[PDB]
Design a protein around this nucleic acid. Structure first.
Ligand SMILES: [Zn+2]
Ligand SMILES: [Zn+2]
Lengths: 116, 184, 77, 295, 49, 50, 162, 107, 107
RNA sequence: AUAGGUUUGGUCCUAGCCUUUCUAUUAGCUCUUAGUAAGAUUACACAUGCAAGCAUCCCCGUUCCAGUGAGUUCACCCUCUAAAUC
């Protein structure tokens, strides 16, 4: 349509079934539906482990670079995955959640030590 | 129980011959064009439909990946295509089982099928590339400093920490604490 | 979702928006980490912007484009 | 410098060794059939059609490159100890792109140890086949590439198809490709159906492996049994070129051996079944006497 | 420093383009300014309701 | 295309009424200081400013 | 049986069997041909046989045919720079005219296969969308991943029966 | 450049009853897709002509204008390709009536 | 055709499906076939087959039993043959029918 | 369509209607489990509950999503160019 005000957004689009997510990295407007008109699809993300177990990610890196140069506003799971790749720096929030995990594991270790 | 006996036994050329198994079955239907799907099963509960399919009408004809003669009868000879269920006369269940029988014999080796001579995947076959050879290691990696040193926790001075208490007192939480290093 | 002309329900006529209570140093290092991350992704973003502008400019007028244009004109003549 | 598989003299020689049987190269295969077309032409246009068929046979019989095995890559790009312990199962990342070559694409793996390791060869091939699929290749390894399956396949004498499936599944530098090809070559050196592998593109690769790892006695035996005598002399020439420090080469250039005498020199120097190869050469010379008297 | 994937890409493309140039691939940061969470905007870019 | 004269007229008079009878800051940003509820808005203030 | 003297002129393979693709500079093609005379025979055959192929492979080029206005058959090409290309076609044949126009102002196999390669650049294999545009709709199909819940039931790690 | 879709079009003059304007019939080949056969489809264009040099029946080329002048006039005359009757053969650039040289090319 | 021995033919009948005329016309055509050897003897040329299953290999099926004609067959560009609109419709894919390629029993 | 039935005392030709095939909705009769897709007939009237907040006040958003098929050639391409993101 027209979508008065807004910008492109490299985001994840759900495309699976019930109890089976699957995400497609697409370049969509911010004001459009989640599964809707995307200007280009830039990759895929399988969160489910395989038979071997690999949680697959595929990125069209040059087109990602092109759409960032054109002005795409990436979303928070997208910076999470691009940092996990190493294309972007690692995200302060995911390392902070990691840190909160370190401290709660320290709490349960000390509590289990007092229990035993 | 073990196949590859009946088809070179005597009763096979007694009842059948050099003709295929399915060369006698005529399915009954409203006339003209047959329905474009056979029955789902001849054996319902443990009872048989009055016009059994060529597989279901003889319980001796077992189907698996080692009944090579039966599987070649049910596959086409001049084309590498499996005969469809209206063409032959077998059930939906029997046609399904025959399809996995063909595939299992094909990938176990006990069946002839055509394989095309394929082209190489790439043009240049070198192995001197950064993704496929060694890379010059990072200074942090030849040392042991964490990459992007703002990842590491560094304790702020108590002065601006007290400034943060002044900003967010009343509803303040508990204190700080350094990261642990090694997990259990 | 709702529009500008939908009346509000009573449970949001009164409902306190209580704040999440605050830690000192996780917060300060969170500010530092956020500002560093924003600075370096700004650097990467301007790098990609300059790259896209360079590709557009060299596609419109580089050296091979002028070479192909003059070869086409000479062939036509 | 030692000439490799990609040189003009050895390539022309292996081409002459393979030979062009049109009825075997362009063979009726069991695929989906269309009604054939017919043409009416003279003898000259018939010769033109046969020459074009010969050229197409050369195009189909262009040789697969024999390559060395690949080093198993183990290169850690980065290690994030802060990331270690956060997630459970690995994360594989692939630069799919469209124009960069497949062996230049970047594929990495993030592990629960925080290690950003560049992907291994097998994971590399599996990801390339997932995201850029090629006809015939399946990411799960086929069960036909096992001991009993390959033995049944060899017993049914479809070694050309063994090599075709191996070419479709594994890259030519892969250890699995190398192992399967040499196992098939060992089986055919044991039994021996070189005619079954003639007029196929894997014939000269078979020759290259045997002359490199010397078991060419059966090749000479079948050559002089099937009267491929120029092929036999040329194969002894390849032996002498690939092993110039051999006493066969010393005696050959000492005695100025050219042909059948070169075969005799190889037989008396390093043939493991020298008595039998010389005996078959004598029977071939008796045949030469017979049809020379007939001539 | 450039993020490790980007570092690998740009070094690999430069050894493919020729010269080794084993210098650490640095990019400029001092161009980017440092406005914190107290800087005020403009009312005309804003607007009264 | 049949013109939307009455829609354009409504747009013009709405813009005019907004320009003339705009609310002022005195009745806009007043505060009932015991309940923190502004008049003409009906929305109270965030918890960081009580 | 199809009507007409030569029914093969209307079979959508003859039309996409013509070989000349005009460059982007040309806009108008004008064919002045003579219906009688032994010398305009090649022009008559070119009008009869090849104008459908030209118009099919160049759908936006305005092609106009003129009958007995001039004593000599000729082709004129009006090009967007303002050029007026003249090709007389007396003492010729239709295939000669074909070759002449593809040499003068037809595109090259160079540009044609480059344009087809750009179309192939548009088409991408790794994309996961509906079968109208892409090749796979999901990774429910590729073996090794988790199958679709419709085809294969998922184990009891699914929520609800948590 | 110009916002007019039809850049260069060759057509035939129909009426000169509008002053400084010519009404031109431009006919293209459009494929009927069932019969797979090309038929002439005709469109009327209005061309601006300053000199009143084109009469009816002339074959004229029309070039586009950067902006339309009137509601329908989106083109201007560039050359009169074929004046009625007085047809100068361009191959041998000499006057002719049709299929016959009025004056001989052996001049 | 089972009584004759033929196994692989397509046959569409149209007009009046009269049984007695069907059999008689079928026998007229099948007895007025022209074979490969007769074609080779009539034209004086080699008869060759090119299958898509084998590839570019030419397979000589019928050779003339007498002299070989030396001037080549005249390549008539854009041949004048009478095509069938049903065949052209099927080749181009506008034959939309729910009856044509239905899954039937053996032969 | 691989076609079939039907005009007549009978044959041939033309012809219509119908059958055989597949899908969708509803009705009858009758129905075990598991998973997954899809799910008002009505642009007729709606009780009730919820669906737009966030946020150091300003702003921003509520002009988006979600829904419907009333109307209907405002959807596609080119030129020009205003919001908007860099
Ligand atoms: Zn059955
Ligand atoms: Zn699925």
């Amino acid at each position: 349509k027209a979508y008065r005000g807004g910008h492109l957004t490299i985001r994840l689009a759900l495309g699976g079934c019930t109890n089976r997510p699957f995400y497609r990295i697409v370049a969509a407007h911010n004001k459009c539906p989640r599964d809707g008109r995307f200007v280009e699809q830039l990759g895929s993300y399988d969160p489910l482990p395989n038979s071997h177990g690999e949680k697959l990610v595929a990125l069209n890196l040059d087109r990602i670079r092109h759409w960032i140069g054109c002005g795409a506003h990436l979303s928070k799971p997208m910076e999470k995955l691009l940092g996990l790749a190493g294309f972007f720096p690692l995200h302060p929030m995911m390392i902070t959640n990691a840190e909160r995990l370190r401290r709660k594991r320290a709490r349960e270790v000390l509590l289990a030590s007092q229990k035993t | 129980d073990e196949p590859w006996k009946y088809l070179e036994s005597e009763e096979y050329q007694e009842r059948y011959g050099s003709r295929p198994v399915w060369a006698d079955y005529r399915r009954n239907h409203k006339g003209g064009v047959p329905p474009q799907r056979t029955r789902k099963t001849c054996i319902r509960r443990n009872k048989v439909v009055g016009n059994p399919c060529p597989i279901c009408r003889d319980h001796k004809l077992h189907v698996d990946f080692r009944n090579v003669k039966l599987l070649e009868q049910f596959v086409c000879a001049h084309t590498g295509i499996i005969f469809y269920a209206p063409y032959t006369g077998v059930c939906v269940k029997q046609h399904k089982r025959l399809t996995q029988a063909i595939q299992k014999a094909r990938d176990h080796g006990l069946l002839i099928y055509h394989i095309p001579q394929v082209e190489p995947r790439d043009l240049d076959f070198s192995t001197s590339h950064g993704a496929v050879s060694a890379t010059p290691p990072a200074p942090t990696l030849v040392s042991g400093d964490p990459w992007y040193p703002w990842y590491n926790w560094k304790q702020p001075p108590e002065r601006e920490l007290s400034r943060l208490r002044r900003l967010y007192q009343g509803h303040l939480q508990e204190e700080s604490g350094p990261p642990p290093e090694s997990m259990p | 979702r709702k529009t500008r002309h939908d009346p509000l329900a009573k449970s949001k006529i009164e409902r306190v928006n209580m704040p999440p209570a605050v830690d000192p140093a996780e917060f300060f290092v969170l500010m530092e980490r956020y500002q560093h991350y924003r600075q370096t992704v700004r650097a990467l973003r301007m790098e990609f912007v300059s790259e896209v502008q360079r590709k557009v400019h060299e596609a419109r007028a580089g050296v091979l484009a002028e070479r192909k244009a003059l070869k086409d004109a000479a062939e036509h003549r | 410098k030692k000439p490799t598989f990609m040189d003009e003299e050895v390539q022309s020689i292996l081409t002459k060794m393979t030979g062009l049987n049109l009825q075997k190269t362009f063979k009726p295969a069991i695929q989906e059939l269309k009604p054939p077309t017919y043409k009416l032409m003279t003898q000259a246009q018939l010769e033109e059609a046969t020459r074009q068929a010969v050229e197409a046979a050369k195009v189909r019989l262009k040789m697969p490159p024999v390559l060395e095995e690949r080093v198993p890559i183990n290169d850690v790009l980065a290690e994030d100890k802060i990331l270690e312990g956060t997630e459970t199962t690995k994360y594989v990342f692939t630069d799919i792109s469209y124009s960069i070559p497949h062996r230049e694409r970047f594929i990495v793996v993030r592990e629960p140890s925080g290690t950003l390791r560049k992907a291994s060869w097998e994971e590399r091939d599996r990801m390339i086949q997932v995201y850029f699929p090629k006809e015939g290749r399946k990411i799960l390894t086929p069960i036909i590439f096992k001991e009993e399956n390959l033995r049944t396949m060899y017993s049914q004498d479809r070694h050309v198809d063994v090599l075709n499936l191996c070419f479709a599944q594994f890259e030519p530098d892969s250890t699995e490709y190398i192992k399967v090809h040499h196992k098939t070559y060992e089986d055919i050196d044991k039994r021996g159906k070189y005619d079954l592998l003639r007029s196929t593109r894997y014939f000269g690769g078979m020759v290259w492996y045997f002359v490199n790892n010397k078991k060419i006695d059966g090749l000479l035996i079948d050559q002089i049994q099937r009267d491929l005598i120029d092929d036999a002399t040329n194969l002894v020439q390849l032996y002498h070129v690939l092993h110039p420090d051999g006493q066969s080469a010393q005696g050959a250039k000492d005695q100025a051996a050219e042909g059948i005498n070169l075969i005799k020199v190889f037989a008396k120097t390093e043939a493991q079944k020298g008595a039998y190869i010389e005996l078959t050469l004598q029977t071939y010379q008796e045949a030469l006497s017979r049809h020379s008297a007939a001539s | 420093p450039y993020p490790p994937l980007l570092r690998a890409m740009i070094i690999a493309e430069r050894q493919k383009n020729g010269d080794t140039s084993t210098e650490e691939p640095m990019l400029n940061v001092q161009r980017i300014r440092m406005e914190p969470w107290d800087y005020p905007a403009k009312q005309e870019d804003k607007g009264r309701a | 295309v049949r013109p939307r004269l009455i829609a354009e007229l409504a747009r013009r008079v709405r813009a005019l009424r907004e320009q003339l009878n705009r609310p002022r800051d005195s009745q806009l940003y007043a505060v009932d200081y015991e309940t923190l509820t502004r008049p003409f808005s009906g929305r109270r203030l965030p918890v960081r400013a009580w | 049986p199809m009507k007409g003297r030569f029914p093969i002129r209307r079979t959508l393979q003859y039309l996409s069997q013509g070989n000349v693709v005009f460059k982007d500079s040309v806009k108008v093609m004008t064919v002045n041909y003579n219906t009688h005379g032994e010398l305009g025979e090649g022009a008559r055959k070119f009008v009869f046989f090849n104008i459908p192929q030209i118009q099919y492979k160049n759908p936006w080029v305005q092609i106009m045919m003129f009958k007995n206005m001039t004593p000599s058959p000729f082709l004129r090409f009006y090009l967007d720079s303002g050029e007026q290309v003249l090709v007389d076609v007396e003492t010729k044949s239709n295939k000669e005219i074909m070759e002449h126009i593809r040499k003068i102002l037809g595109k090259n196999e160079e540009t044609l296969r480059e344009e087809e390669e750009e179309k192939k650049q548009l088409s991408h294999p790794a994309n996961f969308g509906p079968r109208k545009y892409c090749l796979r709709e999901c990774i429910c199909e590729v073996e090794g991943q988790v199958p679709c819940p419709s085809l294969v039931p998922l184990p009891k790690e699914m929520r609800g029966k948590y | 450049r110009s916002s007019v879709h039809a850049r260069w079009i060759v057509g035939k003059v129909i009426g000169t009853k509008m002053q400084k304007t010519a009404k031109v019939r431009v006919t293209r080949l459009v494929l009927d897709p069932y019969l797979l056969k090309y038929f002439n489809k005709r469109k009327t264009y209005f061309a601006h002509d300053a000199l009143q040099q084109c009469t009816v029946g002339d074959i004229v080329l029309l070039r586009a204008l950067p902006v339309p002048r009137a509601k329908h006039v989106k083109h201007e005359l560039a050359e009169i390709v074929f004046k009625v009757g007085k047809v100068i053969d361009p191959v041998t650039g000499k006057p002719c009536a049709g299929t016959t040289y009025l004056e001989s090319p052996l001049s | 055709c089972r009584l004759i021995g033929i196994k692989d033919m397509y046959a569409k009948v149209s007009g009046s499906i009269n049984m007695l005329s069907l059999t008689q016309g079928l026998f007229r055509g099948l007895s007025r076939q022209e074979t490969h050897q007769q074609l080779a003897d009539k034209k004086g040329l080699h008869v060759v087959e090119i299958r898509e299953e084998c590839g570019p290999l030419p397979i000589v099926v019928a050779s003339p039993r007498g002299p070989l004609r030396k001037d080549p067959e005249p390549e008539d560009e854009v041949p004048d043959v009478k095509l069938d609109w049903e065949d052209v419709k099927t080749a181009q894919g506008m034959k939309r029918s729910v009856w044509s390629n239905l899954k039937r029993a053996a032969t």
